[PDB]
């Protein structure tokens, strides 16, 4: 009857923002009391749904996401603003039900020098759509004179070397972010607790 609610939070390694991994949740029990009282989740601010009392409520087709961002863009992942992360990497819809619970992960995701395992997408000619995974890494063209596979002038790669440094500020440390998108439907629910 139990299901891996801990696997999505305590996973081995999360994916990047440009390749965020989506996971379907089915046949679970809503034991969110032990999640809110974990004393490790820094930002539990949930928009639309109260942080507590989630156990006396259960949805139909809840999903899950996983990515890592910087501390300054922790506020960027929200249906209230955009510009750098919710504009090319991963944007949440305006009618999103859930939250972006995240914690400081500056203990196993950073190393001396440059951590090039995680990356993010740079500026693009087009705007990102809600719930879109842009796996393609085509060379961005900033206008005329198409390079067509060459780097240099106005043809920088969309992915950028992140460079997770061990010593950083409060807004420059790694932060593992998980998104619990509640899909409110009318079908008989499958993930419902006590």
């Amino acid at each position: 009857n139990l299901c891996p609610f801990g696997e999505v939070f305590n996973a081995t390694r999360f994916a990047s923002v440009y390749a965020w991994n989506r996971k379907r949740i089915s046949n679970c029990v809503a034991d969110y009391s032990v999640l809110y009282n974990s004393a490790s989740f820094s930002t539990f601010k949930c928009y639309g749904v109260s942080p507590t009392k989630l156990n006396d409520l259960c949805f139909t087709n809840v999903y899950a996401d996983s990515f890592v961002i910087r501390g300054d863009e922790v506020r960027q992942i929200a249906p209230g603003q955009t510009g750098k992360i919710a504009d090319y990497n991963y944007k949440l819809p305006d009618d999103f039900t859930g939250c972006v619970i995240a914690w400081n992960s500056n203990n196993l995701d950073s190393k001396v020098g440059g951590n090039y395992n995680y990356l993010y997408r740079l500026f693009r000619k087009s705007n990102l759509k809600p719930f879109e995974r842009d796996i393609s890494t085509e060379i961005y063209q900033a206008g005329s004179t198409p390079c067509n596979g060459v780097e240099g002038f106005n043809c920088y790669f969309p992915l950028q070397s992140y460079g997770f440094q061990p010593t950083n500020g409060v807004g420059y440390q790694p932060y593992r972010v998980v998104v619990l998108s509640f899909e409110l439907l009318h079908a008989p629910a499958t993930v419902c607790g006590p």
Partner: antibody
Amino acid sequence: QVTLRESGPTLVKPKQTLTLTCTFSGFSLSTPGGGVGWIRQPPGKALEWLALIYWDDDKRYSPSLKSSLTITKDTSKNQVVLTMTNMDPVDTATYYCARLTAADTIFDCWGQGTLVTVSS
Amino acid sequence: ALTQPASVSGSPGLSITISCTATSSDVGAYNYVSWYQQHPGQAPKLMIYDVSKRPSGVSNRFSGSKSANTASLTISGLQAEDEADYYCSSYTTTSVVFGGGTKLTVL
């Protein structure tokens, strides 16, 4: 538990290639944020980190010894091989290989360390 | 590289503190720092891994603090353990520094 012990040659001639290893046990290498290091200390001096390896085979070296110090890994036999050339008399020191459990905890477990001298 | 005093002394039963500053700009914010009570003869050992948090098992009263860029090692009235040295190590921008050696001689 986590135990580190060095094994290999001790005496070496100048202008050679030293191969120092240390067999680890009691823990895994593919753990998130895990890795082993290598630190030396001349008699009567402080410590200086030479190089280390990570879970994703990331060979980070020292800026002064970037070319010589090359570190490898072998998860099948739980062995770590350190290759470095140009044996100099200033390199005469004891070499401890450490264990980096996480990025927060700096070198939790250490090893016994062997006194590798560089002379004639 | 980090700078710390040459050799701090003190009488038994009293309280002492070893300092460790960050004159060099290698550290970005001096977030992670750790000390090593290197018992002279066999190998160093960890006594405090974080700035203030100490590892389990080998810990009685050791602690530490840091205000802006200078670390510290606050010892209790216990000075009769041995003639142990201490090394402050932290992450730099490109390497792993260890500072110098401070022979903590007790009277």
